[PDB]
């Protein structure tokens, strides 16, 4: 149960988000849709308390900032340096970095989870490759594997299906269905309006305020899309 209460995010004397208030129930795969640059991506960052915000967000009657261990954030692969010297195996192991104490290190339990996460997304033989030596789809699957090892109850992805091949997209979606089957909640910021009823069981339309939110068939409608992409001036 994700619960947002009057969340707002300013930037340059301009509210990019204005009084966001939702109750998201799982298990679910929900799509956050709307115009590019219009607050759908910053909603995830406002929830986590990464950027400054003017409200509260909760996970099962506990504040989101005080319970970050229960949630995993898969950022856009566009703001990761591909030429950083790091292997696929090491990149996936970054998910377990909060779990280890200050003077301890990764035991066999942690490496077994790293091996299994790579095997799920189909990149076990790529474990020793540099991240620079991978396609967009393959690198996205490394980030999904890195997400899996956290063993979180909530998974927030920022445009996971943007600029990837179909084979990679098919694998990534099978992994998110596993997260839904396991009772967990998956909240995807989607990059366009492609395959909305195929991926998502609820949708959340965002231009600045939440213009619509609910079950996909009911809320992914021409009326709601018009005022989102038309800025209530269609």
């Amino acid at each position, epitope marked *: 149960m994700i619960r947002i209460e009057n969340l707002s995010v300013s930037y340059k004397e301009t509210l990019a988000l204005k009084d966001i208030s939702l109750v998201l129930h799982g298990p679910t795969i929900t799509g956050i849709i709307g115009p590019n640059g219009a607050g759908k991506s910053t909603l995830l960052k406002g929830m986590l308390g990464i950027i400054p915000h003017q409200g509260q967000a909760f996970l099962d009657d506990k504040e989101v900032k005080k319970s970050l261990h229960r949630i995993a954030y898969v950022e856009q692969k566009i703001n990761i340096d591909y030429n950083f010297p790091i292997k696929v195996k090491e990149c996936v192991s970054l998910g377990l970095f909060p779990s280890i104490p200050l003077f301890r290190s990764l035991k066999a339990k942690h490496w*077994k989870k790293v091996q299994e996460a790579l095997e799920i997304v*189909g990149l076990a033989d790529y474990a020793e490759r540099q991240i620079s030596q991978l396609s967009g789809g393959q690198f996205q699957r490394v980030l999904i594997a890195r997400c899996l090892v956290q063993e979180a109850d909530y998974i927030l992805l920022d445009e996971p299906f943007a600029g990837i091949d179909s084979v990679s997209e098919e694998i990534i979606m099978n992994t998110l269905r596993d997260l839904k089957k396991a009772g*967990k909640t998956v909240l995807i910021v989607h990059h366009d309006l492609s395959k909305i009823p195929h991926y998502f069981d609820q949708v959340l339309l965002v231009n600045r305020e939440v213009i619509a939110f609910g079950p996909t068939k009911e809320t992914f409608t021409e009326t709601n899309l018009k005022e989102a992409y038309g800025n209530q001036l269609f």
Partner: antibody, heavy 121, light 112 residues
Framework: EVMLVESGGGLVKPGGSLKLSCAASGITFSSYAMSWVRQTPEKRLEWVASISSGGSTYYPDSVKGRFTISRDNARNILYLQMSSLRSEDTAMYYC???????????????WGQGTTLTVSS | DIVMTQSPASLAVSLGQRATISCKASQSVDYDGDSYMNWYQQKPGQPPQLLIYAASNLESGIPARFSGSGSGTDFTLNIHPVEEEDAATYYCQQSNEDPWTFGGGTNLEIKR
């Protein structure tokens, strides 16, 4: 719908061999740990074999030596070869997405409909 | 082996009331703060259906009326409120050590 379907069950005399198959739809077996679990006529669930994604198989001592679990990646079929079948092997044999260390896959979360095996003369 | 015995083996509960099923184990089912304990439901005809995995993690499709708890060797499966559709046999199971073992069985009768 994600679905597993077993086949190849039937009658075998004591000492005979039989090979069970498991077809998939929506799952690629190579990516997950896969297992076979049996249910006796007295409703006792017993695990009989598993195969990890890497290829490492492992079995219980009660079934070791006789049963061997394999997997065809290209056709995407999981098999269970049985040999020298004893009378205690009479059971409903299930195909299931087996146990793993990661939180979400710690149980048998998918189960096929089940193909039955009788071992009698 | 890790042997596990459920208690009780047969149970009768009326509608809207608490059902409770135990699963004691010979050895630890948890490993280093990670539970590998799992609960299943089996209605006749169909296979066993994963109900709850680890200690308390609820699989989707199963309503929140079901719940799991406990640690180490002692574990519990609660159902409240109990409804007509919950008539089935219930198994515990561990994925911590070889062989992967199941419980004996617990039949749930709904009163009428």
């Amino acid at each position: 719908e994600v679905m597993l379907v077993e086949s190849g069950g039937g009658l075998v005399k004591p000492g005979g061999s039989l090979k069970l198959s498991c077809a998939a739809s929506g799952i690629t077996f190579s990516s997950y740990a896969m297992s076979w679990v049996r249910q006796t006529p007295e409703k006792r669930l017993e695990w009989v074999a598993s195969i990890s994604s890497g290829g490492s198989t492992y079995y219980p001592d009660s079934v070791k030596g006789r049963f061997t679990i394999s997997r065809d990646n290209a056709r995407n079929i999981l098999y269970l070869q049985m040999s020298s079948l004893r009378s205690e092997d009479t059971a409903m044999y299930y195909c299931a997405r087996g146990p793993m260390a990661l939180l979400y896959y710690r149980g048998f979360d998918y189960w096929g409909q089940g193909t039955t095996l009788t071992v009698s003369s | 082996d890790i042997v596990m015995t459920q208690s009780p083996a047969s149970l009768a509960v009326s509608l809207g009331q608490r059902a409770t099923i135990s699963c004691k184990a010979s050895q630890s089912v948890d490993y280093d703060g990670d539970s590998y304990m799992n609960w299943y439901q089996q209605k006749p005809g169909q296979p066993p259906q994963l109900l709850i995995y680890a200690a308390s993690n609820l699989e989707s499709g199963i309503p929140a009326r079901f719940s799991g708890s406990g640690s180490g060797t002692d574990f519990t499966l609660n159902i409240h409120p109990v409804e007509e559709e919950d008539a089935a046999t219930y198994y515990c199971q561990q994925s911590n050590e070889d062989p992967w073992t199941f419980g004996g069985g617990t039949n749930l009768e709904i009163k009428r």
